[PDB]
Amino acid sequence: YVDVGPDSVKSACIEVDIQQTFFDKTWPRPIDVSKADGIIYPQGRTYSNITITYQGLFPYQGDHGDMYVYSAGHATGTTPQKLFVANYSQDVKQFANGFVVRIGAAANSTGTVIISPSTSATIRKIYPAFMLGSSVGNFSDGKMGRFFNHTLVLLPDGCGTLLRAFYCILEPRSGNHCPAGNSYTSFATYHTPATDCSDGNYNRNASLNSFKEYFNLRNCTFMYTYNITEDEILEWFGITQTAQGVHLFSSRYVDLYGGNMFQFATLPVYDTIKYYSIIPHSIRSIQSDRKAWAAFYVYKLQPLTFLLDFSVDGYIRRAIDCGFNDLSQLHCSYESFDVESGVYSVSSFEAKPSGSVVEQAEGVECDFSPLLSGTPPQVYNFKRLVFTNCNYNLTKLLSLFSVNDFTCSQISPAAIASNCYSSLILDYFSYPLSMKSDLSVSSAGPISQFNYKQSFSNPTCLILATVPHNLTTITKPLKYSYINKCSRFLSDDRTEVPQLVNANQYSPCVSIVPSTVWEDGDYYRKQLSPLEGGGWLVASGSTVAMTEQLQMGFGITVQYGTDTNSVCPKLEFANDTKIASQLGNCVEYSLYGVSGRGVFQNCTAVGVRQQRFVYDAYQNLVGYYSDDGNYYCLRACVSVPVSVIYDKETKTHATLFGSVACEHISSTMSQYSRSTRSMLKRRDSTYGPLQTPVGCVLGLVNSSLFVEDCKLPLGQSLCALPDTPS
Amino acid sequence: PLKYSYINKCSRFLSDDRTEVPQLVNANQYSPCVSIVPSTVWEDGDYYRKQLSPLEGGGWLVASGSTVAMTEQLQMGFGITVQYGTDTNSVCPKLEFANDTKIASQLGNCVEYSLYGVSGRGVFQNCTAVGVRQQRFVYDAYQNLVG
């Protein structure tokens, strides 16, 4: 393992007190995508002074981030004491596609000491520490953030000039206030700046030793160190986790001024990261000497597309988060930072459909009790079960067997249980696990040639299983057997023609074949009459030795109908709101397994009743002749068409919703079209909708003036008169 | 190894002890069940279960495995894959550059080339570097190398 050096001197750890209420600040920092905030440089490639679009993991433009700040600990007079820290040890996050940070964002300024904030000390850049891993949990004291197995360590050590990476296992300590000891409160690490960070001695292991104090290093597999230089200018840093390991991106390595992050380093850790947390730290500074520290920000990445303004210096100087809003969408769609003035359609509102109702059942159980006894048939002797009007829980049925093969076609193995159908059909037979080779829907084997064919008109979930020793009512055939020949000899006794089995049907030769094949290679022949077209029917079969536990095969298929969809899963309707009468929005629904969403009203039944569902020329439901005696007319679902009126000289715009009317328009909305419409809110944070002859709009003054040339015409005699001219 | 062995089950039981959902292995990654599974499967059909916390979303992790008899000479499997990068194409075959003309400076015609495995042919001249350095290869809007 890694040469970690010496262990901690004492079992006890400096006591940690949570003072998190002192750390509250309101210093949010939204991503300015037009300054390329948080932009990681493209991986190993650049472009010249051009505009292009690109997709990758990037923080969303609207994010103001999560902010953290570190402080000096407990100290009084001329000495350090305990660790007065925030609750960062308990701050377990889900790792989410990597993240980027701002370090030193508030540096070269002033703030407060935090824990002693009235001091109003000037603020300086400070480097964050982190831990990541695949598993977290409670400490023996119930404390959050214990990490399990190997963990990913990030810590600056001593000064910001040294950075460490580790991949290692933590060992808790049983001393006073320590991770196994039961006087423990919270994790923390610390720096002792009075002797650390000396200009004749930067303590290369300061922070790690203060870490060692709480946890011994065990199974250290990775270690890296980096030489860094100090600079109060803000830097960007990013992490990703990939199949090629974790990668480290930074502006410090390459781009001090533009802030683009380049892949400074890589890691060999191929373990999935599920959890991400920020490590607590304290400065063991003298009370009289306390100093304040600059705020730190972090932003999670998302799979987003951007328009990118590369400079001739190869740095992205501006960008457009394409999906951030409608205007951004336009810029991105035309790959420019200045779309020409005009009126443009944008994505419609989804109209926020309401939570679902159903009309499924009433019904009886789809009792499967025939499967519980006797010898299941030879493959040419199929026994079939068909259910209608009934409710089931197939997992209870499945518990009765040990399934050694579950495969399906046209449906997931889960979905075949979850879905309602008009019929549920099951074919079952004896079938060993030696010959279990010839069952598939595409099999060309003699099993499919003469004994079974499965139609592709329906989804089908095939099962091979064995019978448990406590299913004593199940019995087994003397051998497992099948037809391996079924052809007709010509009346001239030379030519011969096979009769392949029809889908879901018995081959004709079953009429001459014995219920089981007594001996392998048994064959039988029948002379055929002139009424039968002449010739001889000729058939034969083969056998497989019996097994100590019976082996079984099941073919299961389902049929979807219209008003006959009455086999369903057992309802979970208990403890729920009354259905289906809400009405209401275009409510999502499942009516006897007929699913979709839509608007309904009580309205004039039309021909013909007892068909339930009647559809139009495009097979869209017209309405439902309900069981409550009301015909419910379907009025589908609604959306709001919307467009942008853009005057690029003033850099302003208006919007239209039109025929929807201002009854459905309000100062805020969530239906939705875009995640924000802040581009309108630039002024319309203070304004309501206006109703017009084309219909409801935003961003407009009712001037009612007359215009000689609209410039951006609204049709009819309507007009978007320009905002105040330059 | 004493036997060759593998995982044949890795699913999570629902907290109601009826429904169960499989956790299939991710491409090029370990399945989560390796955290409870032993380094080798000691006996064919060995199975192990872990109750999952509410922090873990509840339920039980359930896993099992199977074994194959050892062979007199060891049998091995190798999965080998390669990644193509841009300016990172630095794993190559050993060069056969010995006993050859000086490269790459000819210039010359549109000379055929392979620059760190970046291949094609083209004309080159010494000319005004553009942003940004240490990306080596910079391309146009159609992903054609600029220089």
Side-chain angles (χ1 to χ4, degrees):
Chain A
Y1 293 121
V2 170
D3 184 358
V4 298
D7 206 350
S8 174
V9 171
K10 60 177 184 181
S11 64
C13 318
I14 298 295
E15 293 178 355
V16 179
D17 295 334
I18 302 304
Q19 299 295 309
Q20 179 274 329
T21 64
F22 289 70
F23 294 67
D24 291 343
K25 297 294 186 187
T26 56
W27 290 336
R29 294 293 181 267
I31 293 299
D32 186 337
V33 75
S34 76
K35 292 174 180 43
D37 282 352
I39 299 301
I40 297 170
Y41 205 71
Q43 184 178 38
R45 182 179 288 191
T46 185
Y47 296 84
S48 183
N49 63 2
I50 62 172
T51 58
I52 63 168
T53 61
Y54 178 74
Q55 183 177 339
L57 296 178
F58 294 110
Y60 193 58
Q61 198 287 10
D63 191 12
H64 60 304
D66 291 333
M67 181 176 62
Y68 300 102
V69 67
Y70 294 94
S71 80
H74 192 210
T76 179
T78 60
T79 186
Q81 290 289 274
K82 294 190 282 172
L83 308 185
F84 281 3
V85 301
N87 67 354
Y88 294 176
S89 75
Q90 303 301 280
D91 186 355
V92 180
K93 297 171 273 289
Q94 171 66 55
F95 181 73
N97 313 323
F99 55 86
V100 292
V101 306
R102 293 182 199 270
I103 300 171
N108 302 309
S109 189
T110 62
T112 62
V113 170
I114 300 165
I115 194 62
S116 298
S118 68
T119 300
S120 299
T122 187
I123 52 181
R124 296 295 182 273
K125 184 178 190 191
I126 188 161
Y127 291 80
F130 305 101
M131 180 172 298
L132 293 100
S134 71
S135 178
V136 297
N138 292 331
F139 281 98
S140 67
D141 294 350
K143 305 300 182 183
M144 298 298 289
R146 184 176 169 192
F147 278 84
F148 290 73
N149 300 328
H150 286 267
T151 69
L152 177 62
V153 183
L154 185 156
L155 59 84
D157 198 316
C159 272
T161 62
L162 293 173
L163 172 69
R164 305 286 161 61
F166 305 94
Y167 200 56
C168 186
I169 299 176
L170 274 56
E171 167 191 342
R173 292 183 197 282
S174 65
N176 178 53
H177 192 287
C178 296
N182 294 123
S183 47
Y184 173 76
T185 58
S186 170
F187 178 57
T189 60
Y190 62 78
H191 180 228
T192 60
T195 61
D196 287 337
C197 275
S198 169
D199 291 325
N201 186 356
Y202 303 92
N203 182 355
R204 73 183 180 95
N205 289 325
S207 300
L208 185 58
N209 287 345
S210 76
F211 175 94
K212 284 173 180 174
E213 179 170 334
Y214 295 71
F215 297 97
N216 180 32
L217 301 176
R218 184 178 296 275
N219 299 16
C220 275
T221 61
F222 294 120
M223 171 274 174
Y224 305 97
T225 187
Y226 304 97
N227 297 323
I228 302 173
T229 65
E230 296 291 352
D231 189 343
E232 293 295 297
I233 294 171
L234 161 65
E235 302 281 9
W236 288 257
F237 165 81
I239 286 298
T240 63
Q241 182 276 327
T242 78
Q244 296 179 64
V246 171
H247 297 284
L248 292 80
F249 302 80
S250 185
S251 67
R252 178 269 179 282
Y253 190 46
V254 175
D255 188 14
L256 175 57
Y257 304 102
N260 292 179
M261 292 171 272
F262 290 72
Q263 184 177 310
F264 166 39
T266 186
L267 291 177
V269 177
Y270 304 125
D271 292 338
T272 299
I273 302 299
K274 295 188 176 183
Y275 300 100
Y276 166 39
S277 184
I278 185 168
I279 290 173
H281 187 91
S282 175
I283 310 302
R284 308 299 292 289
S285 175
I286 290 174
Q287 178 274 323
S288 71
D289 294 340
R290 285 171 183 280
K291 296 182 180 180
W293 310 100
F296 158 95
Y297 303 84
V298 57
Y299 312 77
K300 299 296 188 51
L301 305 183
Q302 299 89 25
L304 299 172
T305 302
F306 298 75
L307 176 64
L308 304 176
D309 181 351
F310 284 84
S311 56
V312 74
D313 295 338
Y315 295 113
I316 303 168
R317 304 297 191 160
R318 308 185 292 160
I320 306 295
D321 181 342
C322 296
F324 183 45
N325 60 61
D326 48 3
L327 182 60
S328 74
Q329 177 187 52
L330 289 170
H331 291 297
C332 183
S333 66
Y334 295 121
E335 301 182 355
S336 173
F337 281 77
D338 185 5
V339 174
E340 180 176 354
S341 170
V343 179
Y344 307 107
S345 296
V346 300
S347 296
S348 67
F349 295 75
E350 301 156 312
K352 183 174 176 177
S354 67
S356 70
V357 298
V358 304
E359 192 71 17
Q360 293 189 14
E362 294 182 358
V364 299
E365 184 177 58
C366 314
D367 186 353
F368 308 110
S369 294
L371 292 175
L372 301 181
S373 66
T375 298
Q378 301 299 355
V379 292
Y380 57 87
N381 290 330
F382 286 129
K383 292 179 193 183
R384 174 174 289 162
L385 306 177
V386 178
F387 303 93
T388 61
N389 310 332
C390 64
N391 294 92
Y392 62 66
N393 183 324
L394 291 168
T395 68
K396 292 178 180 181
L397 177 62
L398 287 170
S399 78
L400 305 178
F401 300 99
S402 177
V403 176
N404 292 303
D405 191 354
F406 194 18
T407 187
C408 300
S409 178
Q410 300 184 5
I411 194 162
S412 69
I416 196 168
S418 71
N419 296 2
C420 182
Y421 284 111
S422 66
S423 74
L424 175 64
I425 302 170
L426 179 152
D427 292 342
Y428 68 97
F429 53 98
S430 64
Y431 199 61
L433 298 177
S434 64
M435 248 325 127
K436 63 157 260 195
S437 66
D438 293 340
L439 171 61
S440 71
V441 297
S442 64
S443 175
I447 296 299
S448 74
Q449 294 173 35
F450 303 119
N451 303 264
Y452 186 46
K453 176 171 187 168
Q454 175 65 63
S455 177
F456 299 96
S457 56
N458 303 75
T460 170
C461 271
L462 300 175
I463 298 170
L464 300 175
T466 186
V467 176
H469 65 286
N470 290 318
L471 275 65
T472 60
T473 58
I474 298 295
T475 63
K476 62 182 73 70
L478 293 174
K479 290 187 178 179
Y480 303 83
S481 68
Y482 58 96
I483 295 170
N484 64 22
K485 183 179 181 70
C486 178
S487 59
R488 297 184 179 92
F489 296 97
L490 190 67
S491 68
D492 294 340
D493 300 330
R494 290 191 296 273
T495 297
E496 188 180 298
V497 179
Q499 174 63 69
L500 299 176
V501 68
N502 289 324
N504 296 330
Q505 292 173 60
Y506 304 75
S507 68
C509 286
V510 173
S511 66
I512 66 166
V513 171
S515 65
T516 69
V517 179
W518 300 341
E519 297 181 354
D520 192 84
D522 279 341
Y523 72 94
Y524 307 96
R525 306 185 180 178
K526 177 185 173 185
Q527 191 172 349
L528 304 177
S529 68
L531 292 174
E532 294 171 296
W536 287 72
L537 187 62
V538 180
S540 68
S542 165
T543 67
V544 184
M546 188 178 74
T547 61
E548 183 65 21
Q549 300 297 321
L550 176 68
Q551 308 306 304
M552 296 182 74
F554 306 81
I556 300 170
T557 189
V558 297
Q559 178 69 55
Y560 189 74
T562 301
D563 60 349
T564 60
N565 289 299
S566 66
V567 179
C568 310
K570 291 176 186 192
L571 292 185
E572 299 301 330
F573 176 48
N575 296 330
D576 197 339
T577 61
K578 301 305 178 182
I579 60 177
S581 177
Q582 292 292 322
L583 304 184
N585 292 330
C586 98
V587 70
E588 299 201 327
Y589 61 66
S590 178
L591 282 90
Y592 291 104
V594 178
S595 65
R597 67 187 58 78
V599 176
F600 299 97
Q601 63 182 52
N602 185 8
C603 59
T604 299
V606 300
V608 64
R609 64 177 174 83
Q610 308 315 325
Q611 295 298 292
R612 288 187 193 162
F613 303 107
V614 53
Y615 307 74
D616 71 11
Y618 305 90
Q619 302 188 44
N620 305 303
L621 188 73
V622 172
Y624 177 44
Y625 183 84
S626 177
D627 289 343
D628 67 8
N630 294 329
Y631 186 94
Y632 287 109
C633 289
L634 176 59
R635 285 287 66 197
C637 195
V638 300
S639 66
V640 178
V642 53
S643 67
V644 178
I645 303 164
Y646 180 56
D647 183 299
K648 83 180 176 61
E649 297 312 303
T650 59
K651 312 289 179 302
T652 67
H653 48 264
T655 190
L656 170 150
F657 313 104
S659 67
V660 66
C662 294
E663 297 301 317
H664 296 287
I665 305 298
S666 59
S667 67
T668 67
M669 193 56 70
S670 186
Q671 299 301 309
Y672 70 95
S673 62
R674 281 295 70 205
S675 73
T676 187
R677 70 183 182 188
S678 66
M679 296 298 98
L680 288 162
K681 298 181 179 183
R682 290 172 67 208
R683 296 292 181 271
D684 291 332
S685 66
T686 62
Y687 298 119
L690 301 87
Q691 183 71 58
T692 81
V694 66
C696 195
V697 295
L698 293 168
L700 286 162
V701 178
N702 181 339
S703 77
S704 289
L705 300 178
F706 292 82
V707 185
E708 292 297 323
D709 178 350
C710 198
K711 300 311 188 187
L712 299 174
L714 303 182
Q716 293 81 42
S717 59
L718 298 172
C719 185
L721 194 162
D723 198 333
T724 304
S726 66
Chain B
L2 293 174
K3 290 187 178 179
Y4 303 83
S5 68
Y6 58 96
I7 295 170
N8 64 22
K9 183 179 181 70
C10 178
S11 59
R12 297 184 179 92
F13 295 97
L14 190 67
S15 68
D16 295 340
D17 300 330
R18 290 191 296 273
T19 297
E20 188 180 298
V21 179
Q23 174 63 69
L24 298 176
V25 68
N26 289 324
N28 296 330
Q29 292 173 60
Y30 304 75
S31 68
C33 286
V34 173
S35 66
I36 66 166
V37 171
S39 65
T40 69
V41 179
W42 300 341
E43 297 181 354
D44 192 84
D46 279 341
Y47 72 94
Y48 307 96
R49 306 185 180 178
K50 177 185 173 185
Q51 191 172 349
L52 304 178
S53 68
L55 292 173
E56 294 171 296
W60 287 72
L61 187 62
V62 180
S64 68
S66 165
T67 67
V68 184
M70 188 178 74
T71 61
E72 183 65 21
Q73 300 297 321
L74 176 68
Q75 309 306 304
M76 296 182 74
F78 306 81
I80 300 170
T81 189
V82 297
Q83 178 69 55
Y84 189 74
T86 301
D87 60 349
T88 60
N89 289 299
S90 66
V91 179
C92 310
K94 291 176 186 192
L95 292 185
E96 299 301 330
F97 176 48
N99 296 330
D100 197 339
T101 61
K102 301 305 178 182
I103 60 177
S105 177
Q106 292 292 322
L107 304 184
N109 292 330
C110 98
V111 70
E112 299 201 327
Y113 61 66
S114 178
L115 282 90
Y116 291 104
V118 178
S119 65
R121 67 187 58 78
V123 176
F124 299 97
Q125 63 182 52
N126 185 8
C127 59
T128 298
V130 300
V132 64
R133 64 177 174 83
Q134 308 315 325
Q135 295 298 292
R136 288 187 193 162
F137 303 107
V138 53
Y139 307 74
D140 71 11
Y142 305 90
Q143 302 188 44
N144 305 303
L145 188 73
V146 172

